[PDB]
Amino acid sequence: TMEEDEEVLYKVRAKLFRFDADAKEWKERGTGDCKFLKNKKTNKVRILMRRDKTLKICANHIIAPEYTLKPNVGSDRSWVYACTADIAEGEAEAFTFAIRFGSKENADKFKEEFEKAQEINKK
Amino acid sequence: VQFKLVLVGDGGTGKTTFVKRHLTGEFEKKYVATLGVEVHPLVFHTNRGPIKFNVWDTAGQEKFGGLRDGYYIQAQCAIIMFDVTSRVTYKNVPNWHRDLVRVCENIPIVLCGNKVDIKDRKVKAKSIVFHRKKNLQYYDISAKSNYNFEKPFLWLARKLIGDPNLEFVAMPALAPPEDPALAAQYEHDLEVAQTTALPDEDDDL
Amino acid sequence: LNELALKLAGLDINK
Amino acid sequence: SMEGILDFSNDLDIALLDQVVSTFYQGSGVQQKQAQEILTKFQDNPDAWQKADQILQFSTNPQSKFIALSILDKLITRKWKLLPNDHRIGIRNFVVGMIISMCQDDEVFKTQKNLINKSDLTLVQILKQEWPQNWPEFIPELIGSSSSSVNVCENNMIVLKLLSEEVFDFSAEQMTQAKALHLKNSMSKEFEQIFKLCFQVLEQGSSSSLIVATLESLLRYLHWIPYRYIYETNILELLSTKFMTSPDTRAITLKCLTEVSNLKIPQDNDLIKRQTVLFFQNTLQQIATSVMPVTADLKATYANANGNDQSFLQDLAMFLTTYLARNRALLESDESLRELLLNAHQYLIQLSKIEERELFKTTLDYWHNLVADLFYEPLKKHIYEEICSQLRLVIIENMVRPTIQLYKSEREVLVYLTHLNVIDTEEIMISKLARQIDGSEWSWHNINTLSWAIGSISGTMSEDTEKRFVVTVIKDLLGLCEQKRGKDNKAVVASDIMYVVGQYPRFLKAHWNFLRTVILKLFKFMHETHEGVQDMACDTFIKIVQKCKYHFVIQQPRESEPFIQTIIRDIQKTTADLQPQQVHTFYKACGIIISEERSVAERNRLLSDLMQLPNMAWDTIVEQSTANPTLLLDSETVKIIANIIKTNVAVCTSMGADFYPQLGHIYYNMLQLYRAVSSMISAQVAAEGLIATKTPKVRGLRTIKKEILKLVETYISKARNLDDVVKVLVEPLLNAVLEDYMNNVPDARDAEVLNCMTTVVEKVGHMIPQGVILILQSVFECTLDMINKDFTEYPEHRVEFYKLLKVINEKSFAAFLELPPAAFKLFVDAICWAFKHNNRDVEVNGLQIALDLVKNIERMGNVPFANEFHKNYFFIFVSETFFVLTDSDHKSGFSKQALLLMKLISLVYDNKISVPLYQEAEVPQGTSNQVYLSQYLANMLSNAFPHLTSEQIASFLSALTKQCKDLVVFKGTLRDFLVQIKEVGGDPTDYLFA
Ligand SMILES: Nc1nc2c(ncn2[C@@H]2O[C@H](COP(=O)(O)OP(=O)(O)NP(=O)(O)O)[C@@H](O)[C@H]2O)c(=O)[nH]1
Ligand SMILES: [Mg+2]
């Protein structure tokens, strides 16, 4: 699965969204376990999300420290941030993401582990 | 190693939305009728290597029927679909099956009852029995909640490869990589993203 | 049953 | 550049067609997509059929000759009668001559099955048009041609197979009852010659491809042929002996014998019974010797998926279940048939072990059939004691969690098996419980499945035997919990201990101390952080409250008060660690008990003590949020208010009419709060726009309103004192919910307002005349405008709107009589607007309103409003119904369209309309409505279907009008009309079928 040489820092169930600004519409991308994976050899923490049942990747990017977690106008359990290099479906395309969780606690906790991992990528 | 899959059924049952959920992961809320056929390559990762599906997403609207049974030629597997919220869709399953097996005499076929995510279910499970005599595999499925949405492709893959112990495995995850000439543009797309509300805020996820 | 009622009353799933 | 074949002014490039075709089939990408939009446009060309004789003669691509036949199929189907009589014989001879040419070239007959099968079907489409009136020699010449080649005879079995299908199996929707009956009669008159060819080929051998194609046509014949062709020949002997040995024929032969098990059989003739027993004997014998014995592990064979095994076992399951559900009585009397009967059931026992859900549901339906017969029919149950013994284990080991329907069926079979033998079922359940304790078969899935089977058979053993049994289970289940180590493994057992006790209320109602212990331990589990234990405790609590509620309201001996009071005193401490949804279930469970207290003032005392906490929190927020109403933006304040209301909904749900005093305790401030919450919902939209309706601040506010309406809807739907509802509840409700709904933006109008008005009108509508009249003034026009632009926007308002108009038409119909004439027109436009919806939750409702509205006008008698209604809207309702009936886009509602149209036609042929339907100048005076109706309809159908002759519209309308009293025939006449408008040249004599 090419995940052995890594460590699990945070795990949460989520529904991932992407923006289609050409249509002004949110489009789902995946539902499954959103994991934070710290590289044992490079200490880099990435996001790796796989869809349930089919186990297909829908998110694969570095938790970059220059990323900012803004709220969505109609949600207290979601975060909207812009990604500049996601390699889920191939080349490092850039996406405007939104990730939603089951409750507000998991979302606020997600912002915690997301700003922690933002620091480990500065080292 | 790709296989041709014809997807047939009454208009409005969920054929196109089903395929988009497997391609993009999105759920299309709008009904836009298919014109003739839409061919899509769809890849699944199994413990016996990858398997590819050339999904011929056909049109159940008769006015948009296109080649009709011409699309079924050389199909190696098939999915008949109907809508459990519309009895006339299960009623037309004998027709859709009849037109199919005349071209594809001996292929694995899955019968699917979509939209089981709706309370007012009109086609009750005890009424669905057409698959028994015709040797078709049945699944209650739903493209909105993904209930059993992997099952029809897992059964066909077991039937086309010949391994009853075939299972979908996790695709290997590579490493992700790491200008101000586009920051004002990426910010321009974020200001609109925030002010566009997320769909289905009353859902579980 | 007064004895059975105490077997289930005491029952600890933390052991 | 590929779009050149679309220019028909030139000649066709056959080689370019073969490129365009292969680019679509074998190609990919955008070149494949463009190749399709051309091949489709080529096919849809109304003159493309003229080039089919080039493609079929000159092309080398088999997929081109397929599409050529597709164009021919369209031409033969829809315009065959518009053809000059010359072409009809050129096409017929070209297709016949082509099929002959492919049977001669074995390279074609072998490697091009698709093109041959397509050709045979196109030949059948001609037979549906020309045979036998213009082709009487077809069947005799078909038989002579069959003795001249194996490839022809085999292909002739394919033509007859498709022919029998198109005539007897798929003709109801596709052809008229006249033309259908014509071909059924034509094939019966010539079948004796067809069966001769079939039986000869089956007996003379020898090519397996010819044998199978022959057997496949026999399967279609068994749908309709007289029984003598099966029982008065020697063909059952061949199906059951000769053809069950070769795997090529085995599959189709089994399907044929499965059909033979369902023919027309005089159950008085002692010889046909021997035939029905004999072919079953032979079949089970060839299976035992040539396939697999009765002891073979069929669960393992199915799991290996070798070749066709999973379909043979599927078909063997269908054959045995079909035969034994109809003929096992023939085997139960004779003692020389006892072993055949049992072996047959032993095969089913093996199949029942196969891990295949749809296969299991099949055999389970037979077991249901059998064990119900052994429960009622005398002397039969002892024949199956060994079959039933194994069946108990089969079901105990595959008990599903309580598909919801698979469980009820499994329980029903398992309950029957307990009545047939209590002693054997105990031994199986306790020994399985023992094998869970030694650890051999121990698993989470396996202990739950066993716990469900034990819980499913409650109430079928004597209260004494059940008592002994439950205790043995509770003992062993507790001992299993001391055994296992780990909260996870112990919670799995401890949860099953609660499912079992929740399943035995008869046991609990006789032992108070044990029941009291169980409830108190359930309360303790409500402080258990383990995932799934709090919901386990809350579900089991209310589950046992439902069946033992009497023991919670009466004063049990050795207790100082009824236990309901003890639950109320500690309810805060009991429900302290539960989620808000679990608290509502707990409060709902208490309402179940309080409803048992028939002492009124004592039931009221309990209700006040139960609602103590949500009332103290209610008065607090009533005060601290009425001055000043700033807290309604604070989320925590909104969430407390919703939970207070949702608690009232919980209790009102289980107490119903016994809830009125608590509703009165909060009613006037709850409606005030409904107002104050509406003020900020509108103030937030004016400050942040329509996006505020998505913000959680407003979504929480709109939740309070959605729950306030839901509490009122719940009580009124269940109230007994309807007078108090009218004179206390309806008055402030309308003056709180209607103007807010009317003067709000469409994106801020709660669709439950319409639902709440529907329940108000459903209960007390006949008592609120001006109330209904006021409800329409505020919700009719403004909601109709929200939905009268497309079938999509505001789907919830769309459904509740027509639910509300429906009940108003049923109850307070006088409210539409008091509508302004301009507003009554919108009411008619809305009803027809519902016809066009594909959404059946709107289409059926709209069709119903029209049907009831017409009856509501018929009851008014010969009065001006009724006459002006028929003058204005009668022919609108007729034409609108005809539109949705013929446009082929509303086929789901054909029955109600037919019913409504029949009511409109009958209203004229019984003179139930007083005034003439027409204008004084457009038709001579004295002309009846029966004539002007047959003229309006004739004109309307000609302008909408110009391809119909004037003689078709006449015969159709003639038959249709004189059948407006027989719905099954009326409906059939519409189906014949719908068939004839898809083609040209329909026979007007086809409407004389009845
Ligand atoms: N509630 C619900 N709606 C569904 C589901 N699947 C599809 N739909 C909806 O049903 C409608 C039909 O969409 P579509 O995928 O185009 O069906 P189709 O069979 O491809 N139509 P056509 O025969 O013309 O090609 C859509 O509005 C879609 O949102 C479902 O699982 N649940
Ligand atoms: Mg489609």
DSSP string, D617-636: HHHHHHHHTTSSTTGGGSHH
Q: What experimental approach yielded this model?
A: X-ray
Q: Taking CB atoms and an 8 Å cutoff, what residues of chain A touch B172?
A: 1-3
CB D802 within 8 A of CB D844: no
Cβ separation D481–C7 shorter than 8 A: no
Is A76 in CB contact (< 8 Å) with chain D?
yes
Q: Distance between CA D792 and CA D895 in Å, rounded?
A: 24
Q: Distance between CA A101 and CA A69 in Å, rounded?
A: 14
Cβ separation C8–D520 shorter than 8 A: no
Residue D759 burial (10 A CB sphere; 0-12, 13-18, 19+) = buried
Nearest one of D808, D958, D943, D941 to D885, comparing CA atoms: D941
Residue B36 CB–ligand 1 contact under 6 Å: no
In the three-class reduction of DSSP (H, G, I as helix; E, B as strand; rest coil), residue B2 is classed as: strand
CATH topology of domain B1-205: Rossmann fold (3.40.50)
Q: Taking CB atoms and an 8 Å cutoff, what residues of chain D touch A76?
A: 635, 696
Q: Distance between CA D951 and CA D958 in Å, rounded?
A: 10
Angstrom distances, CA of residue B58 to CA of B33, B62, B158, D69: 10, 11, 24, 20
Q: Distance between CA D842 and CA D795 in Å, rounded?
A: 10
CATH topology of domain A1-123: PH-domain like (2.30.29)
Q: For chain B, what are the domain ranges?
A: 1-205
Cβ separation B194–A27 shorter than 8 A: no
Residue B59 CB–ligand 1 contact under 6 Å: yes
In chain D, whose CA is at the least distance from the CA of A71? Answer: D695
Q: Distance between CA D36 and CA D34 in Å, rounded?
A: 5
Residue B143 CB–ligand 1 contact under 6 Å: yes
Q: What count of Cα atoms within 13 Å lies in the side-chain half-sphere of residue D766?
A: 4
> What single-letter DSSP state applies at residue D615?
H
Compute the nearest-CA separation of B72 from chain D (Å).
Answer: 10
Q: Distance between CA D182 and CA D492 in Å, rounded?
A: 67
Instruction: State CA A72 to chain mean position distance.
Output: 15
CB D927 within 8 A of CB D939: no
Among A56, A77, A122, the residue to mutate for chain B (most B Cβ within 10 A): A56
Angle, to 10 degrees, between the axis of helix D752-764 and the axis of helix D731-742? 150
Q: Distance between CA D722 and CA D380 in Å, rounded?
A: 56
SS (H, E, C) D567-606: HHHCHHHHCCCCCHHHHHHHHHHHHHHHCCCCCHHHHHHH
Q: Taking CB atoms and an 8 Å cutoff, what residues of chain B touch D32?
A: 39
Cβ separation B70–D37 shorter than 8 A: no
Specify binding-site residues of B. 10-17, 28-34, 60, 114-117, 142-144
Compute the nearest-CA separation of D516 from chain C (Å).
Answer: 9
Count Cβ atoms below 10 Å from residue D237 Cβ, excluding itself: 13
Residue B117 CB–ligand 1 contact under 6 Å: yes
Choose the closest CB to A28 out of B27, B176, B204. Answer: B27
Interface of D with C (CB under 8 A): 471, 474-475, 478, 481-482, 485, 487, 490-491, 494, 497, 511, 513-514, 517-518, 520-521, 528, 530
Instruction: State the closest ligand 1 atom to the C-alpha of B144, by its place in the atom list counted from 1.
Output: 31
Nearest one of D677, D725, D714 to D697, comparing CA atoms: D677
From ligand 2's centre to the CA of D29, what distance in Å?
A: 19
CA angle, residues D274, D280, D286, in degrees to nearest 5: 130
Specify binding-site residues of B for GTP. 10-17, 28-34, 60, 114-117, 142-144
Cβ separation A73–D691 shorter than 8 A: yes
Residue B4 CB–ligand 1 contact under 6 Å: no
Cβ separation B189–A3 shorter than 8 A: no
Q: Taking CB atoms and an 8 Å cutoff, what residues of chain A touch B192?
A: 19, 21, 24
Q: What share of chain A is helix, strand, coil (3-state, %, to 5)?
A: 15, 50, 35
SS (H, E, C) A68-106: CCECCCCCCCEEEEEEEEECCCCCCEEEEEEEEECCHHH
As given in the structure block, the two tokens for residue D457 are 């058979």
Compute the nearest-CA separation of A123 from chain B (Å).
Answer: 14
In the three-class reduction of DSSP (H, G, I as helix; E, B as strand; rest coil), residue A50 is classed as: strand
Task: Count contacts between A and D (CB, < 8 Å).
Answer: 11
Compute the nearest-CA separation of A2 from chain D (Å).
Answer: 31
Dihedral sign from CA coordinates of D599, D602, D604, D609: negative
From ligand 2's centre to the CA of D834, what distance in Å?
A: 24
| Beta bridge partners of residue A13, listed in sequence order | A33
CB A59 within 8 A of CB A49: yes
Q: Distance between CA A109 and CA A111 in Å, rounded?
A: 5
Residue D375 burial (10 A CB sphere; 0-12, 13-18, 19+) = middle
DSSP secondary structure string for all residues of D21-38: HHHHHT--THHHHHHHHH
Q: Between chain D and chain B, are at least 3 CB pairs below 8 A?
A: yes
The values of phi and psi at residue B50, to 5°, are -75, 150
Which ligand is the nearest neighbour of the Cα of B30? 1
Is the preceding omega at residue D914 within 30 degrees of 0, hence cis? no
Q: Distance between CA B191 and CA B193 in Å, rounded?
A: 6
In chain C, whose CA is at the least distance from the CA of D516? Answer: C5
In chain A, whose CA is at the least distance from the CA of B46? Answer: A54
Residue B66 CB–ligand 1 contact under 6 Å: no
CA angle, residues D74, D75, D78, in degrees to nearest 5: 80
Residues 6+ apart with CB under 8 A from B76: B3, B4, B5, B104, B107, B160
Angstrom distances, CA of residue D972 to CA of D173, D199, D653, D889, D969: 10, 37, 47, 19, 5
Q: Distance between CA A50 and CA A30 in Å, rounded?
A: 7
Angstrom distances, CA of residue D969 to CA of D685, D899, D954: 57, 12, 17
Cβ separation C4–D491 shorter than 8 A: no
As given in the structure block, the two tokens for residue D848 are 């119903």
Choose the closest CB to B135 out of D113, D314, D696. Answer: D314
Instruction: State the closest ligand 1 atom to the C-alpha of B145, by its place in the atom list counted from 1.
Output: 31
In the three-class reduction of DSSP (H, G, I as helix; E, B as strand; rest coil), residue B115 is classed as: coil
Residues 6+ apart with CB under 8 A from D486: none
Is B194 in CB contact (< 8 Å) with chain A?
yes
Minimal-distance CA residue to ligand 1 atom 12: B12
As given in the structure block, the two tokens for residue D630 are 């700033």
Compute the nearest-CA separation of C2 from chain D (Å).
Answer: 7
Cβ separation A25–B196 shorter than 8 A: yes
Residue B92 CB–ligand 1 contact under 6 Å: no
Task: Count contacts between C and D (CB, < 8 Å).
Answer: 41
B 35-54 residues with CB < 8 A to A: 44-45
Dihedral sign from CA coordinates of D909, D913, D919, D920: positive
Q: Distance between CA D173 and CA D168 in Å, rounded?
A: 11
Q: Taking CB atoms and an 8 Å cutoff, what residues of chain A touch D695?
A: 73-74
Q: Distance between CA D882 and CA D974 in Å, rounded?
A: 10
Which ligand is the nearest neighbour of the Cα of B200? 1
Cβ separation D696–A73 shorter than 8 A: no
In the three-class reduction of DSSP (H, G, I as helix; E, B as strand; rest coil), residue C10 is classed as: helix
CB A34 within 8 A of CB B159: no
Residue B58 CB–ligand 1 contact under 6 Å: no
Cβ separation D63–B70 shorter than 8 A: yes
As given in the structure block, the two tokens for residue B116 are 């089981």
Cβ separation A76–D691 shorter than 8 A: no
How many residues are given for chain B? 205
